[PDB]
């Protein structure tokens, strides 16, 4: 899983503990 600030998109669900914040985890 990814960690916060792990970058991402809008609605991906990869953050090990959280969602996409500001385009990132």
UniProtKB/Swiss-Prot annotation:
Site residues by UniProt (Binds Cav2.2/CACNA1B calcium channel): 4, 10, 13, 17, 19, 21
Annotated effect of mutating residue 13 to R: Loss of inhibition of human Cav2.2/CACNA1B
Record localization: Secreted
Domain of life: Eukaryota
Tissue specificity annotation: Expressed by the venom duct.
Residues recorded as bearing Cysteine amide in the entry: 25
Molecular function GO labels: calcium channel regulator activity; ion channel inhibitor activity; toxin activity
Cystine pairs: 1-16, 8-20, 15-25
Keywords, in A-Z order: Amidation, Calcium channel impairing toxin, Disulfide bond, Ion channel impairing toxin, Knottin, Neurotoxin, Pharmaceutical, Presynaptic neurotoxin, Secreted, Signal, Toxin, Voltage-gated calcium channel impairing toxin
Effect ascribed to mutating residue 2 to A: Little decrease in activity
Any single GO CC term annotated in Swiss-Prot or TrEMBL for this entry: host cell presynaptic membrane
UniProt main location, coarse: secreted
Consequence of changing residue 14 to N: In omega-3; 2.8-fold increase in inhibition of Cav2.2/CACNA1B and decrease in efficacy to kill goldfish (LD(50) is 0.20 mg/kg by intramuscular injection)
Described function: Omega-conotoxins act at presynaptic membranes, they bind and block voltage-gated calcium channels. This toxin blocks Cav2.2/CACNA1B calcium channels (IC(50)=0.67-208 nM). It acts by neutralizing the outer electronegativity and sterically hindering the ion access path to the entrance of the channel selectivity filter. It also shows antiproliferative effects on different glioma cell lines (M059J, U-138MG and U-251MG). In vivo, is lethal to fish. In vivo, injection into mammals induces adverse effects, such as tremor, diminution of spontaneous locomotor activity and bad coordinated locomotion.
Domain statement: The presence of a 'disulfide through disulfide knot' structurally defines this protein as a knottin. The cysteine framework is VI/VII (C-C-CC-C-C).
Similarity comment: family membership: Belongs to the conotoxin O1 superfamily.
Entry protein name: Omega-conotoxin MVIIA
Originating organism: Conus magus (Magical cone)
Lineage of source species: Eukaryota, Metazoa, Spiralia, Lophotrochozoa, Mollusca
Full-sequence portion shown in this chain: 46 to 70 of 71
């Amino acid at each position: 899983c990814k960690g916060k600030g792990a970058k991402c998109s809008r609605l991906m669900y990869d953050c090990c503990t959280g969602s996409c914040r500001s385009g990132k985890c």
